[PDB]
Design a protein around this nucleic acid. Structure first.
Length: 65
DNA sequence: ATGAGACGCTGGCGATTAGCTAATCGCCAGCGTCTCATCTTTATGCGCC
């Protein structure tokens, strides 16, 4: 309790270990921790039609509100 | 069977009498702090469809 922290990150918890992938069944943290032959980076994970992430982030909000 | 109709110094002074914006420039402008947290964003540094 004597120790106190300040600051906040940039990403949610549901994004790291909440949202799972349809084809895999593992989260983003797992893909970064292990992806086998091609240890693809964050931008390759998100911008991949082979995974579901690009599809599920697009449900975001509405810019034309 | 008679008794109306026909009307001035003013203009050019002084001298009261009364009254008003405008052009020029200068001055001089509330300000002092701290705490606390909060978020951003930037400089540099690392990845190929």
């Amino acid at each position: 309790k004597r120790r106190r922290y300040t600051g906040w990150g940039r990403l949610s918890r549901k994004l790291i270990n909440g949202i799972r992938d349809k084809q895999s069944g593992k989260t983003i943290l797992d893909f970064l921790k292990s992806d086998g032959f091609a240890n693809r980076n964050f931008m390759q994970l998100i911008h991949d039609d082979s995974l579901t992430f690009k599809e599920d982030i697009q449900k975001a909000q509405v810019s034309g509100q």
